Amino acid sequence: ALERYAFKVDYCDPQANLVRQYLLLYFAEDSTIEMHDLKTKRVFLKRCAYPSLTPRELFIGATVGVFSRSLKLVDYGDEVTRRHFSGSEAEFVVFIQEGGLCHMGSIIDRMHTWELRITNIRLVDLPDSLCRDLGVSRRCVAILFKGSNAIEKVGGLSTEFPNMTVVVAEPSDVNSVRGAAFGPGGTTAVMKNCSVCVIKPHAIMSGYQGAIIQRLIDEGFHITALGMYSLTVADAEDFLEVYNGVVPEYQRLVEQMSSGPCWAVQVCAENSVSALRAICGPHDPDVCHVLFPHTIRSKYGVDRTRNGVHCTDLEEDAPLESEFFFSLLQNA
Amino acid sequence: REAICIHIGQAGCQVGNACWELFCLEHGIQPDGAMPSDKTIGVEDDAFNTFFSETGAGKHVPRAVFLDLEPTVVDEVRTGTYRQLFHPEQLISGKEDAANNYARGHYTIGKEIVDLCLDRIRKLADNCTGLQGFLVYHAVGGGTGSGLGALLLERLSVDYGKKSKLGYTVYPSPQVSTAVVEPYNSVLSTHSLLEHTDVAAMLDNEAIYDLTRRNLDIERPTYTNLNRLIGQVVSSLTASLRFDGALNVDLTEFQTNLVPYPRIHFVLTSYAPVISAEKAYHEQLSVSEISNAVFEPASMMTKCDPRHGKYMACCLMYRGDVVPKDVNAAVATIKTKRTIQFVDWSPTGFKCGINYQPPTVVPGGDLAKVQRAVCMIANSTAIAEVFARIDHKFDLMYSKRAFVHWYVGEGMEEGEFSEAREDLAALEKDYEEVGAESADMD
Amino acid sequence: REAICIHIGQAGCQVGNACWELFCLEHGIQPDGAMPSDKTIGVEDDAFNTFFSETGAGKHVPRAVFLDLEPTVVDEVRTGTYRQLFHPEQLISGKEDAANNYARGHYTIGKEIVDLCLDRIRKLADNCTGLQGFLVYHAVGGGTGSGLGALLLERLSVDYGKKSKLGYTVYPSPQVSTAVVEPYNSVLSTHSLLEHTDVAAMLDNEAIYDLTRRNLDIERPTYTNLNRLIGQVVSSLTASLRFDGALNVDLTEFQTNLVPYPRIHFVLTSYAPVISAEKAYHEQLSVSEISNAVFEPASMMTKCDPRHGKYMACCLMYRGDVVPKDVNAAVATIKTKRTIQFVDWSPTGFKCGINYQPPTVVPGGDLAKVQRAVCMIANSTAIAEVFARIDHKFDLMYSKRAFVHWYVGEGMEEGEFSEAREDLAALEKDYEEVGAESADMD
Amino acid sequence: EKVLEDDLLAQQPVTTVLRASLDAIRPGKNDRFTGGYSSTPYVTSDARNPHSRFLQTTNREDYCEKNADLRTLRRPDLGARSRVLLQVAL
Amino acid sequence: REIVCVQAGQCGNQIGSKFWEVISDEHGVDPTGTYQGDSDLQLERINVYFDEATGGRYVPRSVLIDLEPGTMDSVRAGPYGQIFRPDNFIFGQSGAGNNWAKGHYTEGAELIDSVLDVCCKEAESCDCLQGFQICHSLGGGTGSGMGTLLISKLREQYPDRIMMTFSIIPSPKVSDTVVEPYNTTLSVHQLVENSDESMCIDNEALYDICFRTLKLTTPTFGDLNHLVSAVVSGVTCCLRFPGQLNSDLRKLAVNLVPFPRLHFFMMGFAPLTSRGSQQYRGLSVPELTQQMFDAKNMMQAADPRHGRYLTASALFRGRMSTKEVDEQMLNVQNKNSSYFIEWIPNNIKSSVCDIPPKGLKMAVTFIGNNTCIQEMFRRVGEQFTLMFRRKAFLHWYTGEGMDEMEFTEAESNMNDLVSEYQQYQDATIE
Numbered sequence A: 001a002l003e004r005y006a007f008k009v010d011y012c013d014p015q016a017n018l019v020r021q022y023l024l025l026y027f028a029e030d031s032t033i034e035m036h037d038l039k040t041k042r043v044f045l046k047r048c049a050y051p052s053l054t055p056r057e058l059f060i061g062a063t064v065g066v067f068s069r070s071l072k073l074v075d076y077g078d079e080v081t082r083r084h085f086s087g088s089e090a091e092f093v094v095f096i097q098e099g100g101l102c103h104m105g106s107i108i109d110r111m112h113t114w115e116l117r118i119t120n121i122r123l124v125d126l127p128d129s130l131c132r133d134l135g136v137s138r139r140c141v142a143i144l145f146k147g148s149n150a151i152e153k154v155g156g157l158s159t160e161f162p163n164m165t166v167v168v169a170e171p172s173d174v175n176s177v178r179g180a181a182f183g184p185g186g187t188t189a190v191m192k193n194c195s196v197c198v199i200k201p202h203a204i205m206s207g208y209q210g211a212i213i214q215r216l217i218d219e220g221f222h223i224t225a226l227g228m229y230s231l232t233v234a235d236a237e238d239f240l241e242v243y244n245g246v247v248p249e250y251q252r253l254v255e256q257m258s259s260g261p262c263w264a265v266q267v268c269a270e271n272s273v274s275a276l277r278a279i280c281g282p283h284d285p286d287v288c289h290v291l292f293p294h295t296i297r298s299k300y301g302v303d304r305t306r307n308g309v310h311c312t313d314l315e316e317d318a319p320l321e322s323e324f325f326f327s328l329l330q331n332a
Numbered sequence B, C: 001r002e003a004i005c006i007h008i009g010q011a012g013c014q015v016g017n018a019c020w021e022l023f024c025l026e027h028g029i030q031p032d033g034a035m036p037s038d039k040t041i042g043v044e045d046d047a048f049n050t051f052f053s054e055t056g057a058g059k060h061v062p063r064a065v066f067l068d069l070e071p072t073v074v075d076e077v078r079t080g081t082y083r084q085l086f087h088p089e090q091l092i093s094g095k096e097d098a099a100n101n102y103a104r105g106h107y108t109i110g111k112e113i114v115d116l117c118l119d120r121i122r123k124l125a126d127n128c129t130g131l132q133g134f135l136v137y138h139a140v141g142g143g144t145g146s147g148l149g150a151l152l153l154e155r156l157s158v159d160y161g162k163k164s165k166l167g168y169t170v171y172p173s174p175q176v177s178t179a180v181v182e183p184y185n186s187v188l189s190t191h192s193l194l195e196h197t198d199v200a201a202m203l204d205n206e207a208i209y210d211l212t213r214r215n216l217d218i219e220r221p222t223y224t225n226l227n228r229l230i231g232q233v234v235s236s237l238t239a240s241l242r243f244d245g246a247l248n249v250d251l252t253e254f255q256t257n258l259v260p261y262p263r264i265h266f267v268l269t270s271y272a273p274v275i276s277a278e279k280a281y282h283e284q285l286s287v288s289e290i291s292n293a294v295f296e297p298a299s300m301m302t303k304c305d306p307r308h309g310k311y312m313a314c315c316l317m318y319r320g321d322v323v324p325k326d327v328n329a330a331v332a333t334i335k336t337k338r339t340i341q342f343v344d345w346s347p348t349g350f351k352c353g354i355n356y357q358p359p360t361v362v363p364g365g366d367l368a369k370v371q372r373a374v375c376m377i378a379n380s381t382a383i384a385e386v387f388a389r390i391d392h393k394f395d396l397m398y399s400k401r402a403f404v405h406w407y408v409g410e411g412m413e414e415g416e417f418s419e420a421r422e423d424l425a426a427l428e429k430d431y432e433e434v435g436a437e438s439a440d441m442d
Numbered sequence D: 001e002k003v004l005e006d007d008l009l010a011q012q013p014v015t016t017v018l019r020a021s022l023d024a025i026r027p028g029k030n031d032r033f034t035g036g037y038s039s040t041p042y043v044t045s046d047a048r049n050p051h052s053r054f055l056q057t058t059n060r061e062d063y064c065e066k067n068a069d070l071r072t073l074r075r076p077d078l079g080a081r082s083r084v085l086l087q088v089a090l
Numbered sequence E: 001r002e003i004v005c006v007q008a009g010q011c012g013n014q015i016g017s018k019f020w021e022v023i024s025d026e027h028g029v030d031p032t033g034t035y036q037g038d039s040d041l042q043l044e045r046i047n048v049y050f051d052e053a054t055g056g057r058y059v060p061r062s063v064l065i066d067l068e069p070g071t072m073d074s075v076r077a078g079p080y081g082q083i084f085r086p087d088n089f090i091f092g093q094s095g096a097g098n099n100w101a102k103g104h105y106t107e108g109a110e111l112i113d114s115v116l117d118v119c120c121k122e123a124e125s126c127d128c129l130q131g132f133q134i135c136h137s138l139g140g141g142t143g144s145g146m147g148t149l150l151i152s153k154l155r156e157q158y159p160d161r162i163m164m165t166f167s168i169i170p171s172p173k174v175s176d177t178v179v180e181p182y183n184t185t186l187s188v189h190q191l192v193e194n195s196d197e198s199m200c201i202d203n204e205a206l207y208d209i210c211f212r213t214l215k216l217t218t219p220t221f222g223d224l225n226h227l228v229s230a231v232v233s234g235v236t237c238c239l240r241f242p243g244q245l246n247s248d249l250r251k252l253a254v255n256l257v258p259f260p261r262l263h264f265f266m267m268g269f270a271p272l273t274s275r276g277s278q279q280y281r282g283l284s285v286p287e288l289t290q291q292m293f294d295a296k297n298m299m300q301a302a303d304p305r306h307g308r309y310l311t312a313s314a315l316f317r318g319r320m321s322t323k324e325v326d327e328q329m330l331n332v333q334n335k336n337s338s339y340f341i342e343w344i345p346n347n348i349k350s351s352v353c354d355i356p357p358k359g360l361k362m363a364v365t366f367i368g369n370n371t372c373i374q375e376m377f378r379r380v381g382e383q384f385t386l387m388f389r390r391k392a393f394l395h396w397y398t399g400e401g402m403d404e405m406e407f408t409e410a411e412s413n414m415n416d417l418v419s420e421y422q423q424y425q426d427a428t429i430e
């Protein structure tokens, strides 16, 4: 493995409204970290033990929390780390056809167990030209991902899940699907009788996303849309307007949602909003761990700010949130 | 922060090679003075600064001069493996040796070379911002080491003044001997060393041979082993300057704690986990065992027995994974012992230091790898026995003027022998007087 | 509304680059003269008009001339990044320098170039509808800045008459110095400047170096830092013309309030929140703290200590989030202080200005971002010490008529030295007399 | 002499010019000898990075196009919902 | 602003060849004459030393003069020799014979008209002409006599320009020619009237530079001429590149010369260090200033410690802070205050140029006006008086046509030059 990692990170300062850059080092022999300042050439923090940080979470484009600061990994600061990550930078596409929508959560969980990082995801319907050329169905899920020894790892999906996955490795086809599947365009989200569930960034980094989606499928709900979006601070504020003055952790929720990318799903069922609220559980994980031990927030939540998932509370706002996620963010 | 090393003559240069090998390997500077082209992170660290300065291209070069009157040893350094580490101006060599004559080094030959040394040291001292002492390595048995070492220490002491000067000195062993004229040179050296040094560390080759025979399993030791042990000791003492720790010790704290009166500055040195790799897997090495070890006379690097005297002060340096409570429990256990005695005017006999960096392992070395070590420097009245035997050998030779015609021909008055012998007699009487107990009646 | 800037020689062109960088970035004009507006609805505010005029296609071009006798710096401006911003006629350059000779600039060489400059200024003044003064930037230490600046100010003063002329002038520092002949050029410049200027602002590079070392953390400053500070000062003083505020201050109000007698027009300048970005978020920066800051001599851009003199008038410009009540409380606290003293004939010592626009932050800059700032211009008898030291250096050099043959050869009568030196002696005695307490009543 | 010879042996081995010649007199053509060339090519030059000229002025580094960018002076844009509502209200 | 160079005699032609190699390298001119540079900063002042020939080519604004073509064939045979314009080589058919009178009066007046014609052709082509620059030795024959003749003619024809000279003078330890004192004395007499500023170099000082600083085992005249060409090309650098504080030959003269006869200067160039040591010490302004005032690095036999500085000038090339320069010059003036003449408040001028010479991080050239220059002239005057009392070789000069009165005038003028320097050394405020 490694003896010392080295990354340079940026930290968005809310009080100053500047972006500061530091140098983060991780010693893997005894799990200690240390931070330096690039602009001043001075020490920011000694070697201190930090057990919540693990070598598996260290990759480019990730987010970590060190003493109540959100640090985003930007670039390699050393050539040892650059050589160790010489691979793991090529982007490939794995499709899920119509027969595999029922097993998509297990597919995503299997990808996470294989040390693969998902860089985008969407539920789309492709044009007929790419449909014929690639060999996929009309309605499919497109997953974009990267990682070490990627092609040899994804070969196992052919025997675990027969005849529901298509793997793409040629760069030209990847460019075509990147231009076509993602980017500005239409959406498959409905505008009535729907609910929206949002997977928070901390659950994204920890990776319980496949279990959440598969639990939703198992309970009987239907997924009508899915995508990943990155929220700015103003976007996070406009998403949580109704929670201002009502809950005590408004600002912490704002910074958590603006920390990193988040997954947003849409659920359609009978009495969708109440059913999703019942399956997610109460807002506080402490109540869940005592009275509602089977809920999602009991397994994937630690406090009110980081309860794992977010669900619509008022039935008057479900099309509003669905529109905000699947039209305003997606199209522009 | 900074310290300047001055290496004189054959023993001092050869011990210097081992010291700079170790300091390079501990910081990680390659023998060509650079660092690995890959390990660079963008913002380096100050720990080298005690011993190295960097050029604008990032090469490292060390804060040392190598001084000799014969070329051969310095030419070995110039043609060896470390050719690129040293600056060539720093390596100063004369034409011909001082031929075991203190007079030849001091009066005739060293007088030409001494001004280059002062110019190099000045050029070093101008490129500093917190110089805090000189470290000097030499042997007093030979002519150039004694004579030029004394002359250079006198000049340094006038020019730089208050700055501290700590000497590591190889004295003539009590029955192993290498040259006939050793007593004369050692007496004449010691006369100058009394006035112009702040702490003097004592070494005997016979003790380091004994230590390498009993603890290590070496039947046929050679000078490289002794020099590696000395280098390890110096690295342990200077580690307090270079790495983070619980209880730091600045070089002025050694002099403040160890020296009670301005003449009583000669100290004994010892080192605990000298052990081979095969022994290392049969034994645990906790703090209390090595603390008990450092007080046994089998651990000492000078051939003197401390049971024939009284301790005045001890300085214990712990490096590695040690916790202060174990140091306190160990020192209290040592204090309990009946064969360890302190003078009654020194109730608080100990100074402690604790540093986190464990001792380094050298590729060709003979010491095992260990998580902790302790090094001791201590002031004791037993040292008076070391001087008395040299004085007896001087008296035996001087009764017949056995070799004096060389010294008088090379420029010295016969009177200088008697002056030095009287000064060492007064030093012996100082160690007799300081150890007494008075005002018992109250 | 409009003001025209005249830049002379090396210091004036280099300070001009920083000034026009700032005025572009503050208004939002791109390097090619276009304003990248975000909406078509509404209309673009008139504030640019003080410094820019727009063409019928909407390009902006600035109301400035750059004057030099050597081509190189102006050709660098012509080839730099702002090539398209300036009109090419405005950038005027000769063939060869005035070689640190005031006489060469004034009599021989500037006489050829001056009529083109006057024609350009005329072409500017015809394209105005409320010109309210000239701002001039030059250094008095060099030959062309002194000689051509004086000659050109004389011609403007004849042609335009009553219109005001305010100078920002770089004087020879009291112990840092760059050329041998600085006293002659500074004396001869100051003689012409005495008669033909309404307010003169004094600058010393040694003070801005001291300010950048103490408050900012810059070990190795260069002229771009000093010029950016000067540009900030000019932007603060001219902000009162350009943006809304509670208490505006027109340049004639400046002249009316600061100058008591027509010769007593030399003023000190200081700027308060010189602070780095890392320090700025640990501290509040209230009105009273920056008001207390502007009176300490560590804040000044001229190397003089005002405790050795008396203030005659102060003009305080506040820009940003300030409320008049806090200004009144601050000024009353200053008035209470015992180390601040005013001449007894000036009881109402202060003029205030309050502007709503906070200071702009420049991408490469070294100042922090702050919501408020205060800038002070003040008239004080302490300035007499600067002239006394220049005149003393002149007397030492003139005693041997040092270098004088250059000046006599390039066209100047020897008498002009004595006239200028006697006029500066009379100005020094004027500052002695005006500062004398009226203890005599008849 | 040793370090100079090692330096001259360090470069790549094999219209051109003679930067320096260790021999005082060169064999030349026929029996015709020639000499006078410089002993070393490192006079008034640095062997660490020779053939390097730093053709860059102070102003170009100080007043570049990065410092004139106005994108850093703009306040951050609103969220999409606020933009839509702003258009509707206007 | 164009400079015209003149190269006279063997030393002058050789130094000129090395100078024009250095200048062609700095501006990226191929030995064929084609511009091959890689930045506009190189091109924008090429006119200063080069004229443009058709489709690319540049030709160097220089006049080559010698009495026997042997040297001309040697420079033409060199690696850069082709660049020179054929019409610019002027030569006679018999040597100077190491005799001043032949070079000045017999072959001088025969050739001089063709040189004035070439210099006028070269001068009138400039849009604005800056001073002339001349390199020659005083100990030789044609260099001294015809160089000073030509200097007098150019001073008659162009009295408003600058006249600058670089000059080689006989060593105190070993003579290359027996009659060196006569030629030196007559040349110094001519120079003190005609010249505006004159720089002097001793070959002994270049040997001491090479041995102590560069530790060269077997130096050659190519090294000495490279050091001289480096400093010569350095003095003009602010004329031809941008900088934070521009400077010019006239501005140097105005700051250096207190009184018009006191125009003889010392020279130095700072970044000198042996190839073995250079890896051990980085360049910085304190190091350059310390080397700059160290007498080992100065190109005259006289030592500054026996005199006092009237004035000095330093031109810095490279990207550097003004704070370090001003504070270093203040610190040196304060610490050595006894060596600076007290009736001038600041003796040092600084100047800063952005573009260093190739392969150096930073460089400075130093020009110094020091009274210790009087020691060089006294030695030459001694040797002159020793030969003249005995009429040792005078019949050669008198047979060529010299009046003996010329020798007594030159002796009197040189003695007055030494006396004026000595009087200003011991001057006081009173």
Ligand SMILES: Nc1nc2c(ncn2[C@@H]2O[C@H](COP(=O)(O)OP(=O)(O)OP(=O)(O)O)[C@@H](O)[C@H]2O)c(=O)[nH]1
Residues within 6 Å of the ligand: B008, B009, B010, B011, B012, B014, B015, B069, B070, B097, B098, B099, B100, B101, B139, B141, B142, B143, B144, B145, B146, B170, B172, B178, B205, B223, B226, B227
């Ligand atoms: N520990 C140790 N002792 C040494 C070493 N070299 C020499 N000695 C001892 O030091 C004494 C000899 O001193 P030298 O260093 O040879 O004397 P010198 O300084 O060379 O003086 P000159 O002979 O005049 O040149 C003897 O007791 C040797 O045993 C060494 O490398 N290590």
Ligand SMILES: Nc1nc2c(ncn2[C@@H]2O[C@H](COP(=O)(O)OP(=O)(O)OP(=O)(O)O)[C@@H](O)[C@H]2O)c(=O)[nH]1
Residues within 6 Å of the ligand: C008, C009, C010, C011, C012, C014, C015, C069, C070, C097, C098, C099, C100, C101, C139, C141, C142, C143, C144, C145, C146, C170, C172, C178, C205, C223, C226, C227
């Ligand atoms: N603050 C500041 N001072 C400068 C700047 N440029 C030059 N100076 C100073 O002004 C004085 C030199 O005046 P110059 O402007 O070079 O003189 P000049 O106008 O060019 O006159 P000539 O040399 O005859 O062409 C010195 O004290 C310099 O330190 C600058 O950009 N900023």
Ligand SMILES: Nc1nc2c(ncn2[C@@H]2O[C@H](COP(=O)(O)OP(=O)(O)O)[C@@H](O)[C@H]2O)c(=O)[nH]1
Residues within 6 Å of the ligand: E008, E009, E010, E011, E012, E014, E015, E096, E098, E137, E139, E140, E141, E142, E143, E144, E168, E170, E176, E203, E221, E224, E225
């Ligand atoms: N420094 C230096 N001196 C030279 C060079 N060539 C010749 N000299 C010296 O100049 C003197 C000879 O003068 P020379 O040029 O032959 O006079 P000429 O016959 O009139 O041309 C002697 O002192 C030589 O040592 C050279 O390339 N460099």
Ligand SMILES: [Mg+2]
Residues within 6 Å of the ligand: B009, B010, B070, B097, B142, B144
């Ligand atoms: Mg020896």
Ligand SMILES: [Mg+2]
Residues within 6 Å of the ligand: C009, C010, C070, C097, C142, C144, E246
């Ligand atoms: Mg100028």
